[PDB]
């Protein structure tokens, strides 16, 4: 093509403004470009990966640079309980005099307070000065230059690697498990032992004395002699001023369990040992496949042999090896599904088992962190099913998987969908009905008539882990049990102390309010899955459109024929599912926040009683906690939180403009623009100017994507506005 | 230095986008390329 889109000859010959809009939005869809071969495809992606990797390290190098240059890291390290950490400074010519005085409360200049938790993270890994933070930022700027040179270097013709190199699964997997995950874990354990632990004990180890200062008195004699018990001897005392040598141990690899009594975070020597045990597992696991050395497995020979002789799974896994290697959308969909489970797992484990010194003290950051990883977990999950649908449309080969475990899923697709639909209807009817019953019963002044189911199952699990508050005497909470007798010596006493301490996050006290929300969260997960699974399984065709695969993944509709066909494409299923992800993460984030605001406020009973009916949520969570946010600015004056108040309204506006693109459709707008084209052509002195691209209304699929982006960006910005300033405006 | 933000922020906020919006406009509307 010779127009702006040089990759689409068919998009470059369009006379309307639609050409500009599409060249932007199809720029990364590499398989669909004019004259794209398979070998050139893999090369372009590879070099695109380098440039993406460099943007991450440039981003990190930024965050290190702004705190080293404008933060209060040094003042925070000295008094981590009283000073507020500093994101970066503000320079905006639009500020009044009272704005400069409002954003500089407690400092010398205008400044943003950080809620990223990079301070607590950097503190526990060793950092103590601004010089170290600045040195770390220079090393990541150099690393980004190397990655940008590699991306270019691998596009050269002598360094472009062949198609068979990209499909060597047995090698790649071997190197990623043992080298990328194992040796990195091993190296990280070396950093903890030499820098991290010593810095927590008042000893400074930097680049100038790490070669002459051993991290343990024994000094590697116990390691080569098999005397590994010496590294667990003499751990930190119960009363150890953290960061000082007052009550310091010498042990580098312990297994204490629970938290440090002073920072309320995990023991550094427990983390070092954890990273080391994990390093051994990943290094060993990276020796499973055969890579030009004779020994090892062939992945294809594994998969072909797994067909249970009962015949229940059909032909088993024959053909799956070819379908995964010959398709990047299936690989991408498997990778997005595991990352979405993983970043969701990090959101739950971080708030319960706080790993950084002084975490869960800065109330705002805990609220920023948990909801940050839960919203990102939602996008990843929705993107996994979205790419699962794309695979079926332009990558699935029916003859290659005859009677396969993959083919059989399409052969009873109506079962999966109809059953997913039943579970959703069941959860919806009962969970919604129970909430409404509690609302009317309390509205009438008879709250003793409420239906409050006790969550016995979750409580049992808690009792089995050691929680002695539900009086269940099951497992770890019953003293005469082989699970707790084996566990007392190695790590049980640190765990029991931490699990029975009320002022914690380790297994929060749950009641019948915790039971109703979980079934709402269940309903959210099932309906979202219903829309995504239905969209993937009906992507190739349905009764209403038996040749859907001929039109691709995304298309407007099939016209108003045979009833009408709006939102029939598999892309439309993704668009409809987006609303459910936003909604079921929103039910998770409201619940996690409300439960903490009442524990921090000192009245956990407030959430235990009002969370049974809906009005409780609406009045004691939303209406009661929005006070300091919307008082950010008023006729009397403005405060530091004025920006959150401005952002709060900002969100409501973008969300509401998203409604315009979602309710009002195209042929209304096309007719309107035709009168505007007319008017401009008839007005003297405006006639001298003329467009080079015929103005037209946004298309059917473009309006859904735009209306979706507004609904999304408005949705996320208004909650960020609420959750940050309601916590920082009350601090408890 | 401490004098740097009053130099970059007009350049990054007003100058860079005005050059970038001008550059893309010329590229998007250029016929043989």
């Amino acid at each position: 093509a010779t127009k702006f889109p040089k990759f689409s000859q068919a998009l470059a010959q369009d006379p309307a403004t639609r050409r500009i809009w599409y060249g932007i939005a199809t720029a990364h869809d590499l398989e669909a470009h004019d004259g794209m071969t398979e070998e050139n495809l893999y090369q372009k992606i590879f070099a695109s990966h380098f440039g993406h990797l460099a943007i991450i390290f440039l981003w990190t190098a930024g965050n290190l640079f702004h705190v080293a240059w404008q933060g209060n890291f040094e003042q925070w390290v000295a008094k981590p309980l009283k000073t507020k950490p500093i994101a970066h400074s503000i320079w905006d010519p639009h500020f009044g005099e009272s704005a400069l005085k409002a954003f500089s409360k407690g400092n010398t200049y205008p400044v943003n307070i950080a809620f990223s938790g990079v301070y607590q993270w950097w503190y526990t890994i060793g950092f103590r000065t601004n010089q170290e933070l600045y040195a770390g930022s220079i090393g990541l700027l150099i690393l980004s230059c190397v990655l940008l040179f590699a991306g270019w270097l691998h596009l050269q013709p002598k360094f472009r690697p062949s198609l068979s190199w990209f499909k060597n699964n047995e090698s790649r997997l071997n190197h990623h498990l043992s080298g990328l995950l194992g040796v990195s874990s091993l190296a990280w354990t070396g950093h903890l032992v030499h820098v991290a632990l010593p810095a927590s004990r008042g000893v400074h180890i930097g680049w100038d004395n790490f070669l002459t200062t051993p991290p343990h008195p024994a000094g590697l004699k116990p390691f080569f002699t098999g005397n590994w018990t010496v590294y667990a001897e003499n751990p930190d005392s119960a009363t150890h001023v953290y960061g000082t040598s007052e009550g310091a141990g010498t042990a580098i690899l312990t297994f204490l369990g629970g938290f440090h009594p002073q920072t309320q975070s995990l023991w550094l020597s427990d983390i070092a040992h954890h990273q080391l045990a994990i390093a051994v597992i990943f290094i060993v696991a990276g020796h499973m496949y055969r890579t030009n050395f004779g020994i090892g497995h062939n992945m294809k020979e594994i998969l072909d042999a797994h067909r249970p002789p009962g015949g229940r799974l059909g032909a088993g896994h024959v053909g799956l090896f070819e379908t995964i290697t010959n398709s990047l959308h299936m690989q991408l969909g498997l990778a997005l599904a595991a990352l979405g489970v993983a970043t969701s797992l990090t959101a739950q484990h971080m708030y319960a088992l706080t790993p950084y010194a002084y975490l869960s003290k800065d109330f705002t950051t805990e609220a920023a962190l948990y909801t940050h990883h839960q919203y990102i977990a939602g996008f990843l999950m929705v993107g996994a099913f979205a790419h699962g649908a794309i695979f079926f449309v332009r990558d699935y080969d029916p003859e290659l998987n005859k009677n396969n475990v993959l083919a059989r899923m399409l052969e009873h697709k109506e079962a999966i969908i109809s059953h997913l639909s039943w579970a959703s209807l069941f959860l919806g009817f009962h969970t919604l009905g129970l909430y409404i019953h509690n609302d009317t019963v309390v509205a009438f002044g008879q709250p003793e008539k409420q239906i409050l189911f006790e969550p016995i199952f979750a409580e049992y699990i808690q009792a089995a882990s050691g929680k002695a508050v539900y009086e269940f005497n099951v497992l770890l909470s019953s003293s005469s049990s082989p699970a707790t007798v084996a566990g007392n010596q190695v790590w049980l006493p640190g765990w029991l102390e931490a699990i029975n301490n009320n002022k914690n996050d380790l297994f929060l006290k749950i009641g019948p309010g915790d039971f109703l929300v979980h079934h709402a969260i269940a309903l959210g997960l099932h309906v979202t899955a219903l829309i995504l699974v239905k969209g993937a399984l009906d992507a190739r065709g349905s009764k209403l459109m038996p040749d859907k695969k001929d039109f691709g993944y995304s298309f407007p509709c099939d016209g108003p024929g045979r009833g009408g066909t709006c939102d029939i494409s598999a892309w439309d299923a993704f668009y409809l599912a987006m609303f459910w992800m936003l909604n079921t993460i929103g039910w998770v984030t409201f619940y996690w926040h409300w439960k903490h605001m009442t524990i921090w406020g000192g009245n956990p009973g407030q959430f235990d009683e009002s969370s049974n009916y809906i009005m409780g949520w609406l009045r004691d969570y939303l209406w009661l906690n929005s006070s300091p946010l919307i008082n950010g600015y008023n006729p009397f004056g403005m405060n530091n939180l004025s920006v959150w108040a401005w952002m709060f309204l900002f969100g409501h506006l973008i969300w509401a403009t998203g409604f315009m693109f979602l309710i009002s459709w195209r042929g209304y707008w096309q007719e309107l623009i035709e009168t505007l084209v007319w008017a401009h052509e008839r007005t003297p002195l405006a006639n001298l100017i003329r467009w080079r691209d015929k103005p037209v209304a946004l298309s059917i699929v473009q309006a859904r994507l735009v209306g979706l982006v507004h609904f999304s960006v408005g949705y996320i910005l208004t909650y960020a506005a609420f959750l940050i300033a309601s916590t920082s405006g009350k601090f408890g | 230095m401490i004098n740097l933000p009053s130099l970059f922020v007009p350049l990054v906020g007003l100058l860079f986008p005005a050059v970038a919006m001008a550059s893309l406009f010329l590229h998007v509307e250029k016929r043989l390329l």
Partner: peptide, 28 residues
């Protein structure tokens, strides 16, 4: 905390910006 350190950091960002404009040239 030193002015000279800031100057060094954006020469390396200028070299980095040059390798990025050069990397994109080749992707197109």
């Amino acid at each position: 905390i030193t002015d000279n350190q800031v100057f060094v950091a954006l020469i390396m960002a200028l070299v980095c910006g040059y390798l990025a404009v050069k990397l994109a040239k080749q992707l197109a």
